[PDB]
Amino acid sequence: SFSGYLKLTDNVYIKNADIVEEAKKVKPTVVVNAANVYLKHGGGVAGALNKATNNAMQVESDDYIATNGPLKVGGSCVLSGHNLAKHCLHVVGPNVNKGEDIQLLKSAYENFNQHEVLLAPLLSAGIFGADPIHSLRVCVDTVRTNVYLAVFDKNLYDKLVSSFL
Numbered sequence: 210s211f212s213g214y215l216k217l218t219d220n221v222y223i224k225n226a227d228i229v230e231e232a233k234k235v236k237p238t239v240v241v242n243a244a245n246v247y248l249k250h251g252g253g254v255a256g257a258l259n260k261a262t263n264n265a266m267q268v269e270s271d272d273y274i275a276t277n278g279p280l281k282v283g284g285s286c287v288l289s290g291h292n293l294a295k296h297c298l299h300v301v302g303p304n305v306n307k308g309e310d311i312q313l314l315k316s317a318y319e320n321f322n323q324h325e326v327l328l329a330p331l332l333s334a335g336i337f338g339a340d341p342i343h344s345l346r347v348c349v350d351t352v353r354t355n356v357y358l359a360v361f362d363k364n365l366y367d368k369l370v371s372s373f374l
């Protein structure tokens with residue numbers, strides 16, 4: 210099970226960790242991907258998770274998009290977790306760098322409530338351009354299931370913990 214996490218609330222935990230390394234170690238039931246609507250896993254968390262699957266995530270994702278079309282911003286889909294988890298919950302947080310409504314971050318986090326326990330990154334953080342402090346706040350105030358947050362950057366992790374109300 211999950212080790213070395215700092216407990217923020219009744220159900221939200223946080224750790225300074227590489228989500229790929231964490232997923233390979235824990236083999237959780239669900240790992241969350243910071244997906245885009247096209248499931249094009251090019252960079253950030255998505256690029257890293259996909260590279261860890263030797264591109265099997267991208268191949269599965271392209272078939273999913275060919276069949277279903279793009280996801281909605283704020284939406285999700287469950288696909289295989291490959292060598293990282295039982296499942297991957299691809300969740301699309303708004304990309305501030307694409308001018309997407311930051312208000313959609315709460316809708317994005319609501320997808321986590323369909324899973325009792327998840328390993329996840331902060332949605333819309335990193336290359337998605339949102340303030341990670343705000344993302345953690347929305348996470349805590351939206352997710353009711355058990356979420357283990359992996360924050361890659363130590364400096365950001367320390368800032369998130371030290372500023373957590």
Ligand SMILES: COc1ccc2[nH]cc(CN(C)C)c2c1
Nearest residue numbers: 271272273274275276277278279
């Ligand atoms: C039936 O073959 C394809 C191949 C690629 C595709 N990309 C998107 C679609 C259309 N689908 C969303 C209905 C598609 C179909």
